[PDB]
């Protein structure tokens, strides 16, 4: 099932993107 | 004092920038995986045809 | 004075680095879109075959 | 002195961050190439079918 | 027409790459 | 031979990733 794994891939993308947005948000207040 | 505060603001911001670069590297790595996966699949197709 | 000038050079450079990271994030996002599009198309092929 | 040392540590770290951003841009460019290559190949398939 | 949209995609890539080169150019003079 | 060139591509990816890891390693000691 590459389907379950492309779903993993997507969730990883989503998590790292969420973290980057968080860091960018903290970097504007500096 | 205020010079210390100025330095600490700057170093804190350097750590933020570093953390963003680190997360972006993980994203880049995820895109490289995805490209390789697709390249392998397109080949299997291309060889069937 | 020159200490102020030194701080201002550094903060200006931090803003540049931040802006580069921000534009690169948009690029990363465009590559993720492109990969998903291709993955969807390769599947449609794979299922036809 | 120690203020000079503090500035020099910070500028050195700014150069590191800049160099990382520069290498990551090359990586981003390599992924964009790879995506375009795959898009072209998937089209050739799609048109055969 | 994904063609018109992949053309959009490419132009977006080109614009962000041009902006990044501009920012990198300004960052060498610092 | 896109094969030889995708092999080039991979080696380029590997080299830039190795350089980025090196730079990140130097950036933790600061």
Swiss-Prot record, chains B, C, D:
Protein's job: Acts as a class I viral fusion protein. Under the current model, the protein has at least 3 conformational states: pre-fusion native state, pre-hairpin intermediate state, and post-fusion hairpin state. During fusion of viral and target intracellular membranes, the coiled coil regions (heptad repeats) assume a trimer-of-hairpins structure, positioning the fusion peptide in close proximity to the C-terminal region of the ectodomain. The formation of this structure appears to drive apposition and subsequent fusion of viral and target cell membranes.
Region (Immunosuppression): 36-49
Membrane-topology descriptor: Single-pass type I membrane protein
Protein name: Transmembrane protein gp41
Source organism of the structure: Human immunodeficiency virus type 1 group M subtype B (isolate BH10) (HIV-1)
Subcellular location, record wording: Virion membrane; Host cell membrane; Host endosome membrane
Subunit details: The mature envelope protein (Env) consists of a homotrimer of non-covalently associated gp120-gp41 heterodimers. The resulting complex protrudes from the virus surface as a spike. There seems to be as few as 10 spikes on the average virion.
